[PDB]
Every structure is written in C-alpha cells, then in structure tokens.
Amino acid sequence: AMNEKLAKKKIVSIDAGRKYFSPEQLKEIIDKAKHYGYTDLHLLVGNDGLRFMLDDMSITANGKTYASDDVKRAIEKGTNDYYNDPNGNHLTESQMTDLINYAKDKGIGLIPTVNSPGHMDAILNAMKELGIQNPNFSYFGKKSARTVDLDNEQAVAFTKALIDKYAAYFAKKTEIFNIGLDEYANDATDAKGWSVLQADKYYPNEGYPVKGYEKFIAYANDLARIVKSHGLKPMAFNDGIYYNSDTSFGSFDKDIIVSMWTGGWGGYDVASSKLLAEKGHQILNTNDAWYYVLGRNADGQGWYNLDQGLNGIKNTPITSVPKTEGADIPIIGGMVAAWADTPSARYSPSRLFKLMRHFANANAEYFAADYESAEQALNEVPKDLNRYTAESVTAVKEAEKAIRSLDSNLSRAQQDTIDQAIAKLQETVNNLTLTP
C-alpha cells in the first residue's frame, strides 16, 4: 500500500547565482530532470552573484524606500562586480514565471535560493551602491567580500526586506524557499566563520564578535518567519545550524528544512544529522559526495570534479546522509548539485546530464519511470482498424490495453516493463493485416 521510495523528492541543483543560465538552458535541464524521474529543480539565483530581477525591486527599509530602478541598477552592477558573465546578467520576472509554469506542466517543482548572510557578494555590492555604509563583515582587519555584518542594522534590514520581496513573488508558485545560511565569512576567516561567531562566549576579551552566533540564530529565525508568512517552507544548508553541536546559544526554527551537504572536516565540526533530526528538523540529503563544479571535468582537475562526483554517486546512495553518528536518519529526498565556483568555466550540458543520469541510475528504485514514449506510442496507433482482419485487430487492442494497464507509478528500475509493452504494441501494429 506504500510507495515510500518514489514518494521522496529527487532534486537537481543548479548554481545560477554565480553563473548565468538562460531560460532555454534551464528548460533543457527541466526536460532531462523529468526524463530521468526527478521531482524538482533547485535553482540558486542568489549565490555570490544575484541573477533574478523582479519587475518591482523597490525596497522599504531603514525608514525609507530604495527606488526600484536604483535597486535594479545596484544589483546588476554588484553582480557584474562579482562576475560579468558574457552570456547574461539575470533572469527577468517574466522569464521566471514562464520557467516555473513550464516545469509545473511537466510535474517538476522549482525551489529557489537567495543566499545570506554569506555568499551575498552582489547584495553587499548593491547595498554600497545604494549608499548603505559598511555592510561587510570584517575579522581582525580582513574584510569579507561575501558576508554581511549582523551588527549592521541597516544592512541586515535591507537584506531581510529583499528576501521578503523575493519570497512574496515565489508565494503560491513554489513550496520551498532556500535561505542558504552556509559558510559564514569563509573568505575572511579561512573557513573558521562559525567558530569565530561562537568564540566570544567562551574566549571573552579577545576581540571576537560579541553575541555573534546568537545574532546569527536570530537572523536565521527571522528569515524563517518571513518565508513562512508567505506559506513557503524555509530551507537552509546544515553547516551553521548548531555548529559544534552547540545548543547553548539559542534554538533554530524547527520549520527550517535542513539541506545536509557536509559532514564537516578537520577543525570544522558541524552538528550531526542525528542531532538535527532530534531537534525536530526534516532533512534533504544533499551529500557533497555527489557535487560537480563546472569545468572540473576529470580526475586531477580539483575538488568536486566530475569523475569524483560520479564516483560519489556510485559509492554513496541517496539514503546515505552526512555525519549520521551511526543513527538511522530519515530523509525527505536527495539532491545532486552542480556548482559554478569558477563561473567563467564552460557549461557543458552533456556532462551535467551524465551526472543527473548516474544519480538516477544508481538509485533507480527512487526515480520515476519514463512514460513519455509509451504515451507517444499510443498516439501513433492507427485510430480505425475496421479494414484489418479480426485476429490482427484483437492483437493490437490487447497490446494497447496492456500499456494502458501498466502501473502508473513505476520506478526507473522497472523501465524495461514499459519498454517491452511499447515494443509489443509496435509489433502488433506492424502485423496488422488487411482483410482479403
């Protein structure tokens, strides 16, 4: 009576924050997602760069309104300062609405990310262009290019209002909004950002940011409240959520779905997925075992190269969550992610599709089967069979019935059953024999 594996989300993530992707390119990704049995496209649009412009970008914060055309010009410029992509700067509202509709018609959902308080180079740049002072976080004379200072009330207020504006747009047409929250001040702190934010509590009078991590919890919780008010489920990457398993600074909103991408590394001690589940968070398995950075296309070409990602897909199943502590961790689904850390890299659709295809093949019981050729085969049957012999007619009608009788919820693992049924139909049609 249950289809627990197929009921999971299967998601492909595309980094269209750092790098421009056209509507045509994204529709092709949606097509392949549908074909391979995925349920959703996770489209980062704010991730270092910001590459999605609403028709009205006016922002009310700090006792004033920043005019829509000024906000647009500030964001376009700020994104260009991060990376001026010769292929394009941003998707428009019309293009996004069309894209979401295109995906919806195929049974594919779209999940956007607009990242903060890290990975927001372009938003920080935009704020400065609007005239907001000192938005960037700094750590002992090292200014972060990507991370907002949570002590800066004006920068924080603007950012929250911007997330609110995007969330209002995505309301009703999507179900999940990814607020990001990953990798606080990674540049300025040599990947010690969460330690830095927590440090003052335990090492006072050493110049660490006062109430740094407490302010981050408040910030995360406020974004969650904003997203939830629009009927959307907030999602965030795991690394800063109870960093160091420290629950003493406050509590994260339980309605935040956790995208569990990392089990951490030496000197970067993240909460286990066990702890996060126990605190009451649903988890989307986003294991970085499966990561692919565009342009790192073969073994030896760096971390998250395509060969590494395909190896990760082969060796780490959709059910294998980072840092389980040996516990059985339930999941809402799995997400394979392609990134543009070097956004000048060439986007290769065939390589992305290979990654997507391997993820589906390695976990085939979880992915939907493809009925599109079955549907087309049925469309291609001759409508009128009267001029053919009763015997050959019966064979076609039986073969048609057989395809139409297939379980409508088969997995990719059972694709052969569908394909066999199509072949049988084609055979019976070919064998239709005109009456004497």
Part of the chain binding Ca ion (CB under 5 A), chosen from 72-80, 204-212, 303-311, 330-338: 303-311
Pick 93 or 307: Cβ nearer Ca ion: 307
The set of residues, in sequence order, having a beta carbon less than 8 Å from that of 50 and lying 6+ positions away, is 17, 75, 78, 79, 90, 114, 120, 122, 123, 126
Q: How far is the CB of 341 from Ca ion (least distance, A)?
A: 7
Residue from 232, 254, 228 nearest 241 by CA? 254
**Helices 372-379 & 415-430, crossing angle to 10 degrees?**
10
Of residues 25 and 301, the one with the C-beta less far from Ca ion: 301
Considering the rule CB under 5 A, would residue 299 count as an interface residue with Ca ion? yes
Provide the terminal-to-terminal Cα distance of the chain, rounded to the nearest Å: 50
Site for Ca ion in 365-404 (CB under 5 A): none
CB-nearer residue toward Ca ion: 139 or 249: 139
Question: Quick one: which segment of 94-102, 117-125, 299-307, 373-381 binds Ca ion (CB under 5 A)?
Answer: 299-307
**Binding span for Ca ion by CB under 5 A among 136-144, 162-170, 304-312, 348-356:** 304-312
Minimum CB distance to Ca ion smaller for 40 or for 183: 183
Q: Which residue is nearest to Ca ion (CB)?
A: 299
Asked if residues 25 and 349 have their Cβ atoms less than 8 Å apart, the reply is yes
Instruction: Using the structure block, give the residue that is written with the tokens 């009267």.
Output: 386
Closest approach, Cβ 84 to Ca ion, in A, equals: 21
Identity of the residue, 299 or 407, whose beta carbon is nearer to Ca ion in the bound complex: 299
Segment near Ca ion (CB under 5 A); pick from 131-139, 275-283, 295-303, 371-379? 295-303
Find the part of the chain contacting Ca ion (CB under 5 A) among 96-104, 160-168, 199-207, 291-299.
291-299
**Residue 190 in the binding site for Ca ion (CB under 5 A):** no
Contacts of 235 (CB under 8 A, 6+ apart): 111, 176, 177, 178, 179, 256, 257, 258, 259, 284
Sites for Ca ion among residues 40-79 (CB under 5 A):
none
- Select from 246, 307, 370, 419 the one that contacts Ca ion (CB under 5 A): 307
Q: Which is nearer to Ca ion, 174 or 262 (CB)?
A: 262
Least Å distance, CB 187 to Ca ion, is 10
Breaks (C-N over 2.5 A) in the chain follow: none
* Among the residue ranges 141-149, 292-300, 361-369, 383-391, the one whose residues contact Ca ion (CB under 5 A): 292-300
- Nearest CA-CA partner of 365 in 6, 1, 38, 108: 6
Q: How far is the CB of 19 from Ca ion (least distance, A)?
A: 15
The tokens for 140 are 């002992």
298 binds Ca ion (CB under 5 A): yes
**145 contributes a contact to Ca ion by CB under 5 A:** no
Given a contact cutoff of 8 angstroms between Cβ atoms, the answer to whether 144 and 136 are in contact is: yes
CB nearer to Ca ion: give 29 or 337. Answer: 337
Provide, rounded to whole angstroms, the least separation between the CB of residue 298 and Ca ion. 4
How many chain residues bind Ca ion (CB under 5 A)?
3
| Nearest to 198, CA basis, from 185, 212, 181 | 212
> Is 209 or 309 the residue whose CB approaches Ca ion more closely?
309
Task: Provide the minimum distance between the beta carbon of 98 and Ca ion in the complex, in angstroms, as a whole number.
Answer: 31
Q: Is residue 419 at the binding interface for Ca ion, with CB under 5 A as the rule?
A: no
| Least gap, CB of 303 to Ca ion (angstroms) | 10
191 binds Ca ion (CB under 5 A): no
Q: Can you say whether residue 37 is alpha, beta or left, with left for phi > 0 and alpha for psi between -120 and 50 degrees? A: left
Interacting residues with Ca ion (CB under 5 A)? 298-299, 307
